[PDB]
Design a protein around this ligand. Structure first.
Ligand SMILES: [Cl-]
Ligand SMILES: [Cl-]
Length: 162
């Protein structure tokens, strides 16, 4: 298992514009297009992201290309963030994947807001960080996915995904 297979399981794959769990226009493997309510504003962002007139539909190769860029961006945002970087540097390979997953889903700013949990992860207090991470809107809104990420932090294995 690796970050790509992990996020592919969590996000799924859709080749036509769809609405995410929050009602936002998305496409491919969890690629958010816009928070705007307008489907047209979504097709406009989509065409600009792909470089062609898509009419709201993309190919599997186009989805995977957006995915590769989004994973790269999440990793680079972690490495540039003064709050995230030190946590990331401190973790083992598996747990690093979990942090990437959270950043991919809620953005660097969102994750950097989990001040207490981050401190607990850096200290390697696994059980405590898992309890703290669950007291969140994140956990309450997407509980199955959150439990999977939290178990990954707790155990340091890919068990929740196998
Ligand atoms: Cl883009
Ligand atoms: Cl869920």
């Amino acid at each position: 298992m690796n970050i790509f297979e992990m996020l592919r399981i969590d996000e799924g794959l859709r080749l036509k514009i769809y609405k995410d769990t929050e009602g936002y226009y998305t496409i491919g493997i969890g690629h958010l297009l816009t928070k705007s309510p307008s489907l047209n504003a979504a097709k406009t962002e989509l065409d600009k992201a792909i470089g062609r007139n898509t009419n709201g539909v993309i190919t599997k190769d186009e989805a995977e290309k957006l995915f590769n860029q989004d994973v790269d961006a999440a990793v680079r945002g972690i490495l540039r963030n003064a709050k995230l970087k030190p946590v990331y540097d401190s973790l083992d390979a598996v747990r690093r994947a979990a942090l990437i997953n959270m950043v991919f889903q809620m953005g660097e700013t969102g994750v950097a807001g989990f001040t207490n949990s981050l401190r607990m992860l850096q200290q390697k207090r696994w059980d405590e960080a898992a309890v703290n991470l669950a007291k969140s809107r994140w956990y309450n809104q997407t509980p199955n996915r959150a439990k999977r990420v939290i178990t990954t932090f707790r155990t340091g294995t890919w068990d929740a995904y196998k």
